[PDB]
Design a protein around this nucleic acid. Structure first.
Ligand SMILES: [Mg+2]
Ligand code: NA
Length: 360
DNA sequence: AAAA
């Protein structure tokens, strides 16, 4: 019997139900925009469970025994089986508010509030926003518009690997024992991504050395002329605090949101200049204390739905509190240690789910 | 105030 929890399902990139899940993902995104958290969650859970199926749904009978498929969701599935299209998802794709929100938030530095503001001002295109003489843009938005075409184009695996080399080369210059791991979608087996994320940790670095590494690495790139954008968020990590109770847990580790200049010569692909000879790439770096590296790796590998269900399962089924920094057992009244993701899964009483099986 |  298929579990209601993504952390008890294996979800690989061979999705046999993309016709259904692309429609459910659009409906979930619209409910997020319309601030309908409940309807958003119901569509996300339904989309997630269909992504785990090893076969395509071809009739309503095929949905028998599948959890997280309410009456509203089953009406949407029925409509797609009928003529290969979702009239509901088609109406969202043609909605002016939905189109504007997708288009405006595609800019780095533009979120829900700024997209809503521009829509209510009567803006509908990025050309009209950029050329407006009354609008004032944040430094993040200026970078978002300047490098827009590069940031909107997919980062592929040769580019992600080229970025990994740059990150490792810079990091070991200041901390030679540091462990650098690519996380996010690429760790889950994805061919593309909007950004490249890394977890950095050092077994021998001091509290101060750990704090200074992201500043040293970004100053080095600034000197080389590779730092196009940089925002460093200082750590608010607390060694002895209980893990988050929130549905969507916050990460308190030191991190930085960057835009790096990736020279074409560094990329070893099949297509190896054409234009400027470089590509702007969104990169995130996270630095964590050595003893929390398994919790941080688990949180940053994702997917977002896999993380939500992991934390929900820990709370509701095991009376445990899990977040990117720790695992606390409320019955035993102890923090649980882990040197690997496998040990976290074993503490939770879960069969180990490989990173490429976490595409929930 | 509003970047996973
Ligand atoms: Mg990612
Ligand atoms: Na955005």
């Amino acid at each position: 019997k298929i579990s209601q929890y993504a952390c008890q399902r294996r979800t690989t990139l061979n999705n046999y139900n993309q016709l259904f899940t692309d429609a459910l993902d659009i409906l979930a995104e619209n409910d997020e925009l319309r601030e309908n958290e409940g309807s958003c969650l119901a569509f996300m859970r339904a989309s997630s469970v269909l992504k785990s199926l090893p076969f395509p749904i071809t009739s309503m009978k095929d949905t028998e025994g599948i959890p997280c498929l309410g009456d509203k969701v089953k009406s949407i599935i029925e409509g797609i089986i009928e003529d290969g299209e979702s009239s509901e998802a088609k109406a969202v794709l043609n909605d002016e508010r939905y189109k504007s929100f997708k288009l405006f938030t595609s800019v780095f530095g533009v979120g829900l509030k700024t997209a809503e503001k521009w829509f209510r001002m009567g803006f509908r295109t990025l050309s009209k926003i950029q050329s407006d003489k009354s609008l004032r843009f944040t430094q993040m938005q200026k970078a978002g518009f300047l490098y827009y075409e590069d940031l909107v184009s997919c980062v592929n695996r040769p580019e992600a690997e080229a970025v990994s080399m740059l990150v490792k080369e810079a990091v070991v210059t200041f901390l030679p024992d540091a462990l650098v791991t690519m996380t996010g979608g690429f760790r889950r087996g994805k061919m593309t991504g909007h950004d490249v994320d890394f977890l950095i940790t050092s077994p021998e670095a001091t509290e101060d050395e750990e704090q200074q590494l992201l500043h040293k690495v970004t100053d080095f790139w600034k000197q080389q002329g590779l730092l196009l954008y940089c925002d460093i968020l200082e750590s608010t990590f607390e060694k002895f605090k209980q893990p988050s109770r929130k549905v969507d847990a916050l990460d308190h580790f030191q991190k930085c949101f960057l835009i790096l200049k990736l020279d074409h010569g560094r990329v070893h692909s099949e297509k190896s200049q054409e234009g400027k000879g470089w590509k702007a790439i969104r990169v995130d770096l996270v630095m964590c204390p050595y003893d929390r590296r398994a919790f941080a790796l688990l949180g940053w590998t994702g997917s977002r739905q896999f993380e939500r269900d992991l934390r929900r399962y820990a709370t509701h089924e095991r009376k445990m509190m899990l977040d990117n920094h720790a695992l606390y057992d409320r019955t035993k009244r102890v923090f649980l240690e882990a040197e690997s993701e496998e040990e976290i899964f074993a503490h939770l009483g879960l069969d180990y789910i490989e990173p490429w099986e976490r595409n929930a």
